[PDB]
């Protein structure tokens with residue numbers, strides 16, 4: 397099988413010692429094709445980029461979720477929360493079973509009011525900008541998505557629109573995520589040069605644990621019965637085991653949700669708005685839908701469901717720049733991938749989602765183009781062609797949450813503002829564990845529609 401250039405004993409590892417590893421891997425996939433082996437010291441994985449192979453990798457009878465090295469490092473603070481759990485860990489299925497009703501379309505109806513609360517704050521923020529002011533899009537999207545998950549997750553107001561300095565939890569979570577990402581490119585991770593990084597990581601873990609544990613303890617102590625994820629986790633019983641999540645796992649779930657609803661979800665909005673302002677006809681069609689559907693000062697859940705084209709904009713943004721750009725699988729047994737590449741039990745696969753989503757055999761030669769209309773009919777999209785939310789039982793539990801939040805907010809943004817790519821912004825995708833259009837800025841001229 398193909399493999400990119402190697403650096404002696406470091407194998408391919410230095411290829412990921414780059415500011416933009418996902419984009420680096422995409423370029424490697426561009427050159428090497430649908431599958432390449434990627435070796436690092438004591439690690440081998442295969443990056444899959446074609447729907448042809450990924451549809452097989454998505455076969456849960458043959459492949460299970462693997463914790464990528466990145467997820468393994470995030471597990472140091474997301475614990476056995478859902479995204480850093482192995483499927484075979486008791487706490488995975490337990491939490492999966494308990495949390496699924498909390499994340500369904502039907503649950504979104506109950507989160508909707510809280511999402512609107514934050515979305516209106518975003519609108520009001522942009523409504524209150526002065527004429528020459530501009531919007532730092534990823535920053536504001538993250539304010540929105542963090543606040544939304546804080547409010548819907550555990551009735552906690554990060555009040556991100558009231559600050560420029562991040563919440564202590566977010567400082568530690570961002571710095572812990574950064575430490576996880578840095579631990580990946582390190583050729584010598586045991587070197588004492590990183591000893592302070594390891595110590596800071598420990599301090600960041602303890603910070604996140606303490607603040608979330610206190611959030612949990614505070615909720616148990618107040619006895620308050622909100623309808624947020626925290627309440628469901630405190631009160632939920634896994635139908636299978638009959639057991640609730642323990643407080644430790646609930647903390648990990650909360651940390652996981654905060655990670656996920658932070659820049660992973662804000663990236664979706666950031667990229668969506670990026671593609672909208674880069675595609676005025678798409679923007680206009682999306683804004684026309686927003687105006688036609690969002691006839692009330694506050695969007696209802698039902699109206700957000702009616703933002704079909706906005707939904708397609710988000711999918712198309714997810715297609716081009718999936719904010720969770722890769723997921724790892726391992727072969728449950730010896731198997732043959734694509735009739736060509738024999739895998740041994742335990743062999744790892746990486747699904748390079750942005751490259752999958754550029755599979756010209758699926759999307760046509762207009763792959764780079766932002767055409768939300770690609771998603772008019774999900775039935776017309778081949779199986780496993782579109783995997784921004786991962787796969788199978790290990791798919792994104794937050795998908796409905798992310799999409800509802802994004803659709804609501806994008807709908808309101810499109811209703812309330814005309815957007816100007818006033819700097820003719822050059823897409824620069826900053827890579828952390830997610831992707832964001834770094835420095836993406838717009839001007840939003842209010843249509844002066846009241847809320």
Ligand code: HEM
Nearest residue numbers: 478479653656661664720723784785786790792793794798
């Ligand atoms: C646009 C936004 C989002 C995207 C693109 C996204 C993407 C993904 C992907 C690709 C996976 C699979 C990871 C893997 O297989 O290793 C995943 C899993 C997961 N996501 Fe998301 N996510 C988003 C937002 C959210 C939100 C808002 C939440 C919760 C508040 C969330 C919670 C989770 C959880 C708990 C899992 C693990 C589910 C399980 O394995 O049982 N995500 N997500």
Ligand SMILES: O=C(CCCCn1ccnc1)N[C@@H](Cc1ccccc1)C(=O)O
Nearest residue numbers: 412417418464466479580720721722723
């Ligand atoms: O696999 C992940 C981790 C992304 C996890 C997405 N996600 C899901 C839920 N929450 C987040 N990165 C990819 C790409 C990469 C490589 C080196 C450094 C950074 C990134 C890989 O390791 O090859």
